[PDB]
From a paper:
Protein interacting with kinase C1 (PICK1) is a membrane protein composed of a N‐terminal PDZ domain and a C‐terminal BAR domain, and is expressed highly in the brain and peripheral tissues. It functions as an intracellular trafficking protein involved in the internalization of amino‐3‐hydroxyl‐5‐methyl‐4‐isoxazole‐propionate (AMPA) type receptors which are localized on the surface of neurons and mediate synaptic communication. The PDZ domain of PICK1 recognizes and binds to the intracellular PDZ binding motif on the c‐terminus of GluA2. PICK1's PDZ domain is unique in its ability to bind both class I and II motifs, however, it binds class II motifs (i.e., GluA2 (SVKI)) with a 10‐fold‐higher affinity over class I motifs (i.e., PKCα (QSAV)).
We fused the class 1 PDZ binding motif QSAV from PKCα to the C‐termini of the PICK1 PDZ domain to enhance solubility and aid crystallization. The purified PICK1 PDZ‐QSAV protein eluted as a dimer on size exclusion chromatography under reducing conditions indicating that we successfully designed an intramolecular interaction between the PDZ domains using the fused QSAV extension. The structure revealed electron density that confirmed that the dimer was locked by two disulfide bounds between C44(A)‐C46(B) and C44(B)‐C46(A) between the two PDZ domain chains of PICK1. However, because electron density for the fused QSAV tail from the dimeric partner peptide was visible in the peptide groove, this method failed in allowing BIO124 to displace the QSAV tail within the crystal lattice. The crystal structure that was obtained in the attempt to co‐crystallize with BIO124 represents the first PICK1 structure bound to a class I PDZ binding motif (QSAV from PKCα). The class 1 PKCα QSAV peptide has an alanine at the −1 position and is unable to make this interaction. The second difference is between the polar and nonpolar sidechains at the −2 position. The polar serine of the class I QSAV does not make an interaction to K83 in the αB1 position in PICK1. In the class II SVKI, the hydrophobic valine sidechain at −2 position forms a lipophilic interaction with the aliphatic segment of the Lys83 sidechain in the S–2 subpocket. These two additional lipophilic interactions support the observations that class II peptides demonstrate higher binding affinities for PICK1 over class I peptides.
Author numbering:
A (entry chain B), B (entry chain A): 18 to 109
């Protein structure tokens, strides 16, 4: 677990270019599921598939659904600071 | 949000071509993070990045580390059955 944050410029459609997963009844943690090609997320290159989302613009995501965190990100315009954890996976 | 199970054939390196996340303290649930190209999991089409792993060959991974989860897939030769939830994610 190496912690961080990064600020991504929204594109013209007010998207940074990620899907967020988790935040379900028994799975409190929130994760970046895909980084879509050719989006600001994709081009900065800090975050990746599998990284955990700990915060948006200086605010926890603790106990929120993926929708609520998706809203937290839409509502921010122009740029957005995604708090994360780079995480390991086990290949199989 | 849909439970299922897929039996897959191990390759010659006794692998199926997925990655595993979560399975950690404060982050109980376990996820498929990458599906690797030209591998059985990818060639099979059933599973995608972001789906929950919930069981293997009839056993529940409940409460295990991703290290342990990988152990359990690597143990079974020839083919392994993976129990999973197809999940969704909010795009931003």
């Amino acid at each position: 677990t190496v912690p961080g944050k990064v600020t991504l410029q929204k594109d013209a459609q007010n998207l940074i270019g990620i899907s967020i997963g988790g935040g379900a009844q028994y799975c409190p943690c929130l994760y970046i599921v895909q980084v879509f090609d050719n989006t600001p997320a994709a081009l900065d290159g800090t975050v990746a598939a599998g990284d955990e989302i700990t915060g948006v613009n200086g605010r926890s995501i603790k106990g929120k659904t993926k929708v609520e965190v998706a809203k937290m990100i839409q509502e921010v315009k122009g740029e957005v600071t995604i708090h994360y954890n780079k995480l390991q996976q086990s290949a199989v």
